[PDB]
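Reviewers asked in the last cycle whether our approach scales beyond single polypeptides. To address this, we selected a multi-component target totalling 751 residues and predicted its structure end to end. The input consisted of the following lines:
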Amino acid sequence: AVYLCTCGTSAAKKFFGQTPRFDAAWVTEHGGVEAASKVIYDTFRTARLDDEVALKRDLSAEIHSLARMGVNDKDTVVLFSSETADGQACAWAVKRYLEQARPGILCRIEVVAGLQVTDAHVFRTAGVLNFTKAVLHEIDANGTGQCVLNPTGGFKSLVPYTVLIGMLRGVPAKYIFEQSSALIPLPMMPVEFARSRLEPLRPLLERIQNETAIPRAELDKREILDSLFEDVGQGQVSLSPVGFLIWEELERPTALVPFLSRRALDDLLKMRATEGTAPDDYITRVARSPEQLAHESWSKGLFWLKRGTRDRYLVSVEGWRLLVWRIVDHDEYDDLLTQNRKTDAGARVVAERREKYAPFVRLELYESHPQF
Amino acid sequence: AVYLCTCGTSAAKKFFGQTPRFDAAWVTEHGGVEAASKVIYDTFRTARLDDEVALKRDLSAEIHSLARMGVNDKDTVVLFSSETADGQACAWAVKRYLEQARPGILCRIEVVAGLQVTDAHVFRTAGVLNFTKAVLHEIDANGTGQCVLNPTGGFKSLVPYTVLIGMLRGVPAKYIFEQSSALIPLPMMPVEFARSRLEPLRPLLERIQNETAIPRAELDKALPSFEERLDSLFEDVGQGQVSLSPVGFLIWEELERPTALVPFLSRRALDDLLKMRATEGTAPDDYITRVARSPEQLKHESWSKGLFWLKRGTRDRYLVSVEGWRLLVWRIVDHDEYDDLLTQNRKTDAGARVVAERREKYAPFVRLELYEWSHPQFE
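The resulting structure, written as structure tokens, was:
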């Protein structure tokens, strides 16, 4: 498995309360990050992963949690460190211990720019965004289902971002519960992405990504506005992690929502006698996997799907919307292919979009409690 | 403002590292929760709310965060405490301090059964549910826009539930960021309830709420294939039995008492709406969506079968009913057809006659989400 770990400074706990205190200057005095990480590591290098007293008392929160996850020599551990020298020295100490305890394990330290414990503004405009980007890159750069989010080791402030990333990418998250030696999963609430209400923001999110920041006044031209954006000065806003996650989903959808043209809803209702709700289930199933969806092709991005079955589907994709223009049996399918041999059939379909096909309506059909 | 604060033991930080350590036995040795809270309070009683060094170094995380929020003598502070004696003694110490610092402040300590730092099983069953229900009850017991969630003081493990509660009830949540002295909001992702995917579970969740738990075998019969699942709604409570988790509780509550409706148009109503495009555009769409988002804004001329009429402001009228979370729009009509329909309802039980034709004339209802290309075509 690939463990994506937040990292704190609990590796250095033996130094808490001593003077000189453990801080960045301590790291320098002890020779820099790598040299200082050996001094830190030495304080717990004899603690065994099998010793329950040492696991809780002597070992770092990262090591305790990874041991409870059954970390082994076939795993990868990615330690997301603060940019500070003492943060990094602790992460390197954890790496040293994991490599000694489980020879062959792959352990990588990812330093997150702007992630630190003293400057809230740098955290909220850069640190947490860099964290979110780096974690999402790692999820997308490993195999599906392989990642586990482990927020045990530091930054209470990063817990909600781990929850959101986990909800969105389908990645589980676990941590050690308070003073116990027991893991618990973070809660994940099943939700749908609010695509229809967020879509009008798509050009503004793209503008911020291309231009770094735009005037806050463009946002209004209200809870969504506050949660997607960060004030950065001079009346300008950039993205929050939530704004970044929404921008990324709008630019590169990971699910589609099916819509039926006016004609396709008629088509579907006539199929109810022969096929029941099998056509509904199929379209809904196809919309869930736009990568797998990525056929007999027309112009204008129109193309044909076949469920198995008499029914064939003339569709296109516009952003996150899977548009079903027609649902036809084999005879009408053959007639439509003949029209495309004689004419540019796709161009004629879109020419009639407004008069014949629009509005497209979401494929969510409703067909003993007290009244309102 | 009503500050809903999760508490920890930072009030007792002056006793950390001592032997005997600060714990439940320490509270007992110092006379119990009330008496021990005075001993804890005495260690910082002389620290001042306007002293910047004291705020960042000497005062508890609850006090520091409340100070940065501008707590004052007209506010209410609810201190959600662990059930442990040391947790409670700290909460009472914070109460003692706030009442001296802001005389007239209303401060109450809410002891959350099952909330504690050593038993993960009791936490994940009783503790988080009791916390969730206590916070939700306080939100619903105060006026709209009055509550602020403050997770600073303790329990890293409760932050995710504060986030979900804040998201679902639209209540702000702020906290002191790490070792800074600055407040930052919890992130709030705008999401849509997966109502179509969750509605099939309404009778299952109601059944679970009517029993102490249900056997896993019965859950598995009610749920789809194991490899295609929803598991976050449920919590194992031992001996092969399952109850609702806080996530399952929040979903169940919303299914039973919706806080927003989703408008659907009958087959006839979408025809009606499209004929109004020329004169009205999408103003009818906006009205229907607006009154659905607010069950308080949602009514006149009741018919039978739960049907009733709405008026936008304009001659159009809407024949509607509510089924669970769905605002069903049966017809949209002009003033003349409205009058003629009222006439049919004086001569007959018109609502009964409408419902008799549900399958043939009105079903299926379609979600009022109408789409009506400047990006690269799908790859």
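The longest helix of chain B spans residues 120-141. We regard this as preliminary and will revisit it once experimental data from Aim 1 are available.
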